Paper text:
[name] is the first DUF3225 family protein that has been shown to possess a catabolic function, likely decarboxylating the product of AtzEG-mediated deamination of 1-carboxybiuret as part of the cyanuric acid mineralization pathway. The data presented here imply that [name] is a decarboxylating, 1,3-dicarboxyurea amidohydrolase. [name] belongs to NTF2-fold superfamily, which contains 38 protein families, including the [name] family: DUF3225 (DUF: domain of unknown function). Size exclusion chromatography performed on [name] after removal of the his-tag, suggested that the native protein had a molecular mass of ~ 29 kDa, consistent with a dimer (2 x 14,655 kDa).
As 1,3-dicarboxyurea is unstable, it was not possible to produce crystals of [name] in its presence. The wild-type and variants were co-crystallized with 1,3-dicarboxyacetone, a stable structural analogue of 1,3-dicarboxyurea. This may suggest that Tyr22 is the catalytic amino acid residue in [name], possibly acting as a proton donor (consistent with the catalytic role of tyrosine in other enzymes), with Arg46 fulfilling a non-critical function As the substrate analog binds between Arg46 and Tyr22, it seems unlikely that Arg46 has a role in activating Tyr22 (noting that the substrate analog may not adopt exactly the same conformation as the bound substrate). However, this positioning of the active site residues relative to the bound analog is similar to that of the catalytic residues in inverting β-glycosidases that use an acid-base catalytic mechanism, and it is plausible that that a similar mechanism may be used here. As yet its catalytic mechanism is not known, but our results suggest it involves the action of Tyr22 and Arg46, and that these amino acid residues are positioned relative to the substrate in a manner consistent with an acid-base mechanism.
Numbering used by the authors:
A (entry chain B): 2 to 129
B (entry chain A): 3 to 129
Write the structure that this text describes.
Amino acid sequence: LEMQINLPEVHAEVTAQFVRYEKALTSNDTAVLNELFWNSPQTLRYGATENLYGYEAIAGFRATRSPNNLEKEIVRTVITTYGHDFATANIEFRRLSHSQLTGRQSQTWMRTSQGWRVVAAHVSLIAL
Amino acid sequence: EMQINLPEVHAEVTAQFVRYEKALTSNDTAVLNELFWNSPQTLRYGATENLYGYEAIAGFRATRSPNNLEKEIVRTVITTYGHDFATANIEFRRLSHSQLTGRQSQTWMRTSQGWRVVAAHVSLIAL
Ligand SMILES: O=C(O)CC(=O)CC(=O)O
Ligand SMILES: O=C(O)CC(=O)CC(=O)O
């Protein structure tokens, strides 16, 4: 894997799915948000204020989340692919409601037979 | 899907995770640096800082205070995918900050020199 860092075609596919994910967040398109998370009990998301274990818990969280005050400005993005089937996506952002905090979002992506999926995610806000 | 938690692979990664946790408590920076992937792509979103590239992470390790190190691990999920990739996610607590619960996420890759962390993210939140 270490011999195949950021193969152009792989990096392009993952970047596309990442943009898809970010677009679905802004429109609260829960169908796409759920589509992009790996459907497995192992999948997990450490959110800004909650820890969710399993796809079912993540999907359930998305159903009960309010689409209000969701906007976020991405400031930095690093997408790295390893071989043909694995990737990480790491971003910094600012959320408009907490202008004094810098946001971090990490995702690990895996290529499944149904396409790229997030297997684990972690979001946090800090003051620098 | 594609070979989830193969016993031998899951055992190797769990061993390296235990190695990492032991090196944190003894502030064994040699082992801490050994376990992070030596690449400019490697990154660590720390509890209080964002570091890009192995050199920035190694530099941070040389200057860090080892004092408030100890922590109770409360949940661990280690998941391996095929033979060469893994994630490790833990929740932890400290008696020194009873109001904060910790999260630590890592993505691991098998290199020719062994398993390495390619990305990590640590954060503390209120209960
Ligand atoms: O607020 C959070 O927990 C993170 C977030 O913006 C939506 C996501 O990336 O799932
Ligand atoms: O104290 C913690 O759990 C987070 C941390 O920075 C140790 C590490 O770098 O793994």
